[PDB]
Enzyme design. Sequence first.
Site, PDB file in Angstrom:
ATOM      1  N   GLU A 200       0.829  -1.165  -0.062  1.00  0.00           N
ATOM      2  CA  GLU A 200      -0.047  -0.007   0.182  1.00  0.00           C
ATOM      3  C   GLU A 200       0.825   1.163   0.120  1.00  0.00           C
ATOM      4  O   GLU A 200       0.323   2.235  -0.659  1.00  0.00           O
ATOM      5  CB  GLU A 200      -0.862  -0.191   1.226  1.00  0.00           C
ATOM      6  N   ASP A 209      -6.613   8.381  -4.558  1.00  0.00           N
ATOM      7  CA  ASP A 209      -6.016   7.023  -4.957  1.00  0.00           C
ATOM      8  C   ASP A 209      -6.175   6.410  -6.400  1.00  0.00           C
ATOM      9  O   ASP A 209      -6.287   7.570  -7.335  1.00  0.00           O
ATOM     10  CB  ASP A 209      -6.777   5.933  -4.063  1.00  0.00           C
ATOM     11  N   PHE A 293      -8.057  -5.922   1.808  1.00  0.00           N
ATOM     12  CA  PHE A 293      -7.664  -4.803   2.063  1.00  0.00           C
ATOM     13  C   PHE A 293      -7.711  -4.120   0.678  1.00  0.00           C
ATOM     14  O   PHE A 293      -8.443  -3.026   0.463  1.00  0.00           O
ATOM     15  CB  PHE A 293      -6.319  -4.660   2.597  1.00  0.00           C
ATOM     16  N   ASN A 321      -4.790 -20.173 -10.897  1.00  0.00           N
ATOM     17  CA  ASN A 321      -6.251 -19.790 -10.996  1.00  0.00           C
ATOM     18  C   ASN A 321      -6.500 -18.394 -10.891  1.00  0.00           C
ATOM     19  O   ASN A 321      -6.991 -17.745 -11.751  1.00  0.00           O
ATOM     20  CB  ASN A 321      -7.173 -20.480  -9.745  1.00  0.00           C
TER      21      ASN A 321
END
Length: 432
Positions: A200, A209, A293, A321
Amino acid sequence: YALSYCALILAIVFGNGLVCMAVLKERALQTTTNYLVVSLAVADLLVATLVMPWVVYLEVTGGVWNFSRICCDVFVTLDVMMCTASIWNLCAISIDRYTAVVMPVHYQHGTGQSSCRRVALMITAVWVLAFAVSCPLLFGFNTTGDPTVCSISNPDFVIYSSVVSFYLPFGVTVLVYARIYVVLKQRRRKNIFEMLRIDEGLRLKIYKDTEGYYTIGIGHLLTKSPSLNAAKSELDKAIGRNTNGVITKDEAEKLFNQDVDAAVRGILRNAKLKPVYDSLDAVRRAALINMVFQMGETGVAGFTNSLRMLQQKRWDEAAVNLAKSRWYNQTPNRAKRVITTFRTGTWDAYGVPLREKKATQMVAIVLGAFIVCWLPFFLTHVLNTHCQTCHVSPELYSATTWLGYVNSALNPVIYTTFNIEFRKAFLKILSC
Ligand SMILES: CCc1cc(Cl)c(OC)c(C(=O)NC[C@@H]2CCCN2CC)c1O
Ligand SMILES: OC[C@H]1O[C@H](O[C@H]2[C@H](O)[C@@H](O)[C@H](O)O[C@@H]2CO)[C@H](O)[C@@H](O)[C@@H]1O
């Protein structure tokens, strides 16, 4: 030291001629570290072709110089310039490793992009610093008491160069490498907190963001409104003081530690994510928290196929996957590190890679080689010209200089010793 020097001459143009050939051709070897290794290899190629021929001439005579004083100046400055270029490159590399060690997840990202306009600027710097240090000799500061003696005899310049050529860049690199040791010796494990910090990142002012939403601290979304007021209003509310857009590190941290809790709770209240999270381990749990998150409890809940695969403990399958997802195309590096965490159940995704440890180890020894080769000289040449107890016979002096030139031909012998991929490419060019 008659034919000996000629042997060394070829040894240098041979090895460092290869070192350059390997990098320029081999795709794999084209990394920022190596590119600095090239320029360091060039410092040695020039020394062997523009300085050492003259060193071999002054050896045949007993130290008598029959060529123009202008031709002596060129000869001596070049000798200073290459040696200045070497030690400084060597320092440029030291810092390069320091960043690959301290900030390893970011180093890999910032070497995989248009990362040449930096390398350019580093190589440039090093050479321009190289030249400026040497150029005074060119404009008269190569003074001697007899024209047949061609050597650096100036009391002031010698002190200057010794500091700028060696004792400064050596002092930098030694204190850089001091810190490299301190960090690699301090093998603190990682956890959910240090994980998300990396992924982050931490900011103190408010910022928009990736979606365009106001955020602050370690990925904390403040508000989906286009108001910078509402953002500050929610920011104050979350901290308990009028921030006015800015916070501290420790505030940012506590705000983050909450969001992580809410993330845990959010999952246990989810009827899909709880059975997954229960059957996961401390580390793999940390990667689920990490996805939630990034994506919120319900977004993560939509990887139905993969969530089952993680419950059935099929790790490798789940990883292959999850790659097939829209999450991966959007943020492919962060995905690779979370998927690796799931696959392996370790934090090797966020560690210092093996490849880089082995480089950092190699260039510690290339540096070691240098200081062992050149420290003898810089102590002798200083003490010969600033004299009181001159236990300094010219027999010794020839060695200290000889030793210094040997250094050049060693680097490629070290690069083959410890680096496998150089060793691979070297026999590839020699096998033709
Ligand atoms: C101490 C400052 C200092 C710094 C540097 Cl980089 C120098 O060049 C290596 C010298 C120096 O003596 N050069 C000329 C001598 C004579 C010819 C060969 N060469 C020795 C390598 C030197 O005195
Ligand atoms: O998606 C749940 C999280 O949303 C915010 O943080 C996100 C947000 O999606 C956005 O700023 C960006 O994509 O990254 C961060 C987290 O990766 C909340 O502030 C978090 O508490 C939620 O977990």
